[PDB]
Amino acid sequence: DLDFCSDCGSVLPLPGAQDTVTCIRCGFNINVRDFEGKVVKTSVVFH
Amino acid sequence: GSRWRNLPSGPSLKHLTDPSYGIPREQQKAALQELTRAHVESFNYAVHEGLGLAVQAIPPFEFAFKDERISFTILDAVISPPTVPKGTICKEANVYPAECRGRRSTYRGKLTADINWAVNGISKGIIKQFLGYVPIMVKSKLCNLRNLPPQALIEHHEEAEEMGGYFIINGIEKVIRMLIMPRRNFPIAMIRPKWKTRGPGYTQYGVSMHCVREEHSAVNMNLHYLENGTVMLNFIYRKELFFLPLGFALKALVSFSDYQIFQELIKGKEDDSFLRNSVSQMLRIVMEEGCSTQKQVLNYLGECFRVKLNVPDWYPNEQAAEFLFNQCICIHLKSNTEKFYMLCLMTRKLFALAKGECMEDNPDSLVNQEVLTPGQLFLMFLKEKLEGWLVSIKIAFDKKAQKTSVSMNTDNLMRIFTMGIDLTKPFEYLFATGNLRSKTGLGLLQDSGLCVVADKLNFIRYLSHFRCVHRGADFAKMRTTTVRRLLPESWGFLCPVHTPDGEPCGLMNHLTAVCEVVTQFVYTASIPALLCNLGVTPIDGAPHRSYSECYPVLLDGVMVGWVDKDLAPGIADSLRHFKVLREKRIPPWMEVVLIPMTGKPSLYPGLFLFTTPCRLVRPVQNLALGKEELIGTMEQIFMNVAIFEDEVFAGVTTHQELFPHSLLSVIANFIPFSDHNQSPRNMYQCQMGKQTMGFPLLTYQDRSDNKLYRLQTPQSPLVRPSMYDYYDMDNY
Amino acid sequence: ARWQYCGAPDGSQRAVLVQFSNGKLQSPGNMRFTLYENKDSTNPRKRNQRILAAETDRLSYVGNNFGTGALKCNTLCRHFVGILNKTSGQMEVYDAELFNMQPLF
Amino acid sequence: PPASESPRFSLEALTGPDTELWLIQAPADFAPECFNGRHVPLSGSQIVKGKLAGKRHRYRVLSSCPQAGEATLLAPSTEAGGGLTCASAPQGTLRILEGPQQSLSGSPLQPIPASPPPQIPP
Amino acid sequence: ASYDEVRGKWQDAHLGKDQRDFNMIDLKFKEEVNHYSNEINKACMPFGL
Amino acid sequence: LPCFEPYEFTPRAGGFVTGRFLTGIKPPEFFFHCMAGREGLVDTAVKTS
Amino acid sequence: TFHFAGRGEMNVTLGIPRLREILMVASANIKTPMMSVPVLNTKKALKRVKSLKKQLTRVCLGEVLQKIDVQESFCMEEKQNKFQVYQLRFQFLPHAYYQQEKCLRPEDILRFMETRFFKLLMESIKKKNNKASPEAMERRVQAVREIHPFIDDYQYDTEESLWCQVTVKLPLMKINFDMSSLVVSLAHGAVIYATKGITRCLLNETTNNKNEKELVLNTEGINLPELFKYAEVLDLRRLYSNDIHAIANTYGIEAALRVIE
């Protein structure tokens, strides 16, 4: 779930803030309220 | 295989009583002679072509003062067969070894160099320097006995059946022993607790790789695996271990904007949701420090390291970074993009390990262990030692502005070239003792007992002494039995009854009788096209079925693409054909191992090829095509080998061992009725027989050796094993 | 499939294709491309050099047919284009050129 | 500089739903003219015997719909002043390979004589 | 069971990636076969020397 | 050992030598035997010291 | 030449080190204090002795946990784009399995789970940031949130008692750690209930061809004062330790000898 490609150059830094998310390279900013990437995790590993 | 097409069928004595006993033959014996192909073959290739590609990597060096860019370099260097200092009138200005033994002196060589005196850019001079001497392995392409027939031998009073391969330092005969080091250019997994404690958040896991170049110096890699989620690189240069996260390397390598990196280092496990997060996390924690573009990260790394790397304070901060990068990371490749893909495949394996999809490949078998020849050690010691001569000439030139004398710019070359930095002493030392007084471990972990004096008290002593791998003197005080118990795979590449019981028991093995180390390099020229003009898809193309199921195809240090589920066995069989028929530049020395996907924790899947030197290999017969075939250590584990004819089952088996006698070494093949005996007796005798006292040798006037035990009236023994003749032992 | 070969309509331009090594982009109906032909029409190592540099707002992609930065297939596997007409059932075959792209900072 | 190719390349030409776009791969040397007037499978793999200036060459070809849209065709645009734009996803891919000629599995097996019983006493 | 019963084959296989189950089958097999030795070296010496 | 199919069921794949010292042991079983001898002598020497 | 003796019965330090610690060290130092314990061969003894075994076992947390499941992201819709949340579930092994062995019930142990896990997790978050520096169940869970505001929710779903699901939220300033595995690094560390010192007590048969069939059980660990509470289903007269020091202070020195020998 990397913030993928339309305008920036790099990995878009984490939301991790109060405002909407820029880039470092070109500065193309996008809405902080877009991402809903839902993560799943570990499992049966204990017997 | 054709070499063993003439074994005797039951010995005889017809040959002790013929009119021809006594008159020297013309073609000296074949087998006995090739019994030491490896030693002289390597040293052969060393000095005639090895320091060819091994002087074209010493860095241009001299920088002394006055804004000068003098960069004097070696154009060529060579060695010439050993002649005599000009005698009063020496009739023949050549020296033969038999002379060197009598007078307790060495058997040397002549070293020459071509330095170009580029005066801040090529201006002046190419001065030849007489560096020093070097010893010469007898009967290489550098000793006067090169290519002589037997009579020309006995007239020189050297014994008729010479095999050579030793050096002569003051009469003694020293031999370099073959050691063992891991596989060449391979990502071998590993687990170990001792790693845990080097810093914070180290797990036990990781991968490894031993990388060696043409100009044979070596480097050792390591990628740990953090629990946090990041992956590191832990290498060492010039005796100090270094630290570097993965982000800096995968940015500094190729400009190649990162989403490339992510989408490529993620091959088809898209379902994961911790892997990709760890990936993105790396990519961020490398971005927000001081750097955005490629030159930027280079700038940063150089600014950090040029304090330790000790480059000239002339150069910019990025040049030193780049200099460092391609001197200690994935050397064998000599490019960048392939350095990238190598790092990629390494980490993919490391992950699929730590998550537990594969099985931890043993780093202790013979499936992952090969052999160092004396040529390697020799050449690499030499190439290290040249640098020291350059830097010493530097201080020799600095003594000028130090003594505040005339710090000259040119026409002082001759004088400033005699410092007293010769190469005699450092080489006489390495052999005189066996010690390795040096500055680089050259991949090795030890430095002593490297060449030990071959005795002459018998003929069995010699005939073994030249066929003896050993695993390094450091593994002796250890108590674990796992370093001695014969793994069931070493069948055919080591001898089970020949270990020298005592203190260095179990380790100081000897080779089998049907294995030959590989020492002829090939032109790796047209094989990738050959791969790709079949099913193999290009490396970064659009692979028609490119996802979780597809095999990488490494090539002795080169990614070449991917193959899919249907093809891999078809490709492996086709290359089987095109080796055995020996058709199109496909060497016979080649291994074609494909490891299928078990769906279960097992060996890492793949399909691997090699051509590199220094590997064990032994012939077998094929039941598909009549011809005989060569098998590498790695690809026995997936073959069916029928020992006797009575076993051969149609459709399931493929090979047929040549003769059953293979398993044993040669010495342990001179024992009679040896499957009846009990094993510890076999071993006791293979130790004993070397101790005995029989007919050592003919010329009792050549050698002033110290102790020669002789037995007046020896006799041929009546009950004999076939291989007593095939080596014509009866002369001794 | 009726197989008809036409060669190249001009002889110096095949069917140009663009494969980005980073997946599949979303609205490539917005992009403009830059084809580069080496003007030294004599030297067969330079007469044929093509640089497929792709200006995009996020990634400065570039494609080529040379070096370790190209696909060996362009040098070891030819590429064609098949134009199959569903009406009369004919495949139109030209020469086609693949190029692999890399985004420069 | 984008020039003027066949009007069968303009993106206005390929948008026909009755026309198909197909990407093909053949090794460095496959000369196309042999296939002329020949048939190529549209799904599955069929060995063909091509005649390139009389010589009989045989090739096994792959015919299947691609992994989803691996790449795009650039097609001359009339509105974009020659600036090249993307086409649709091609309807299929063709891999072409010369099927190995005269290769059996290996053979029937081969025997060896048996030594053991030697001369018994004189 | 067949002589290479794909079932038993796969079982022995997967457990080969463990220690304790493999040791269980090890010991069982051992003390299974070790009652042909007592019928070899007993119907033999010292009754037919 | 590189002579048998993976995961056979003959006890030969174990250590069940059958021949004796008056008729000869076959080629394969000659290897296992040596393994055992080596392990034994090692344990002896170490426990002695 | 390796022994063929030993049931699998916690064999203790072999070889010279035992000799050294007896003559050359003489320290407490013991690796496995396997005490000896006979049952005074009464009649009933059974309904008492097996319950005794059970209650003198020791079960920790890391034995009974079977699965962990996390779903951790996305916190923007909870009224505002705020501290990142964690969806979380535990799966144990079915009550029938352990229930026969350990004398345990899945509900009160769940109570201990909710009781301790949460002060525990607060400890764990604390140390991480330092190193980086039913209406009854309703009142339970809302007090959880009370004495720990960070803890948003808790749901012991009542039917199964074989699966629990919580839901948390803490600030997104600190960077994520092995959370999915910090549940694991705090699982093992916990022990539910255990007598002081002793862990392992087992039960087997005596010997008759040796002596008069005095049935024995097999304990491990030295806390003599505790053994007395069971006073009527064992033989506290023929009772010697493997330690040479646990009995030293409880019985004497003439006590020590026979056991030394």
Residue numbers in the entry:
A (entry chain I): 16 to 62
B (entry chain B): 4 to 735
C (entry chain N): 9 to 113
D (entry chain M): 22 to 143
E (entry chain A): 837 to 885
F (entry chain A): 935 to 983
G (entry chain A): 1230 to 1362, 1495 to 1622
Could you pull the original sentences from the published paper?
Human RNA polymerase (hPol) I has a single target gene, the 47S ribosomal RNA precursor (pre-rRNA), from which the 5.8S, 18S, and 28S rRNA are processed. Hence, dysregulation of hPol I is associated with pathologies, such as cancer and developmental diseases, for example, Treacher Collins Syndrome. A catalytic core of 10 subunits is complemented by a protruding stalk subcomplex and a heterodimeric RPA49/RPA34 subcomplex. The composition of hPol I is similar to yeast Pol I of which detailed crystal structures are known.
Here, we show how hPol I can be exclusively purified from a modified human cell line in its natural form and determine the structure of its non-crosslinked apo form by single-particle electron cryo-microscopy (cryo-EM). A 3D reconstruction with an overall resolution of 4.09 was obtained, revealing secondary structures for most regions of the molecule. The cryo-EM reconstruction of hPol I shows connected density for the common hPol subunits RPABC1-5, the RPAC1/2 dimer, the N-terminal domain of subunit RPA12, and most parts of subunit RPA2, with exception of the C-terminal clamp and anchor domains (residues 1,010–1,134). Furthermore, density for the jaw, funnel, foot, and most parts of the cleft domain of subunit RPA1 (residues 630–1,661 excluding loops) and for the RPA49/34 heterodimer allowed unambiguous fitting of homology models. Similar to yeast Pol I crystal structures and cryo-EM reconstructions of apo Pol I, the linker and tWH domains of subunit RPA49 are flexible in human Pol I. The N terminus of subunit RPA12 can be placed on the lobe of subunit RPA2, demonstrating stable association of the subunit. A C-terminal extension of subunit RPA34 specific to the human enzyme is flexible in the cryo-EM reconstruction whereas the assembly of RPAC1/2 reflects the conformation known in hPol III and tightly interacts with subunit RPA2. In our reconstruction, weak density for the stalk subcomplex, the clamp and dock domains of subunit RPA1 indicate increased shelf module flexibility but could also originate from technical drawbacks of freezing or sample preparation. We found well-defined cryo-EM density on the downstream face (front) of hPol I subunit RPABC1 (Rpb5) that is closely connected to the foot insertion site. Hence, we constructed a homology model of the foot insertion and fitted the resulting model into the observed cryo-EM density. This allows an unambiguous placement of the domain without adjustment, indicating that the hPol I foot insertion indeed resembles a built-in HMG box. Overlay with a model HMG box (box 2 of the human HMGB1 protein) shows that the DNA-binding site of the hPol I foot insertion is completely occluded by the common Pol subunit RPABC1, indicating a divergent function.
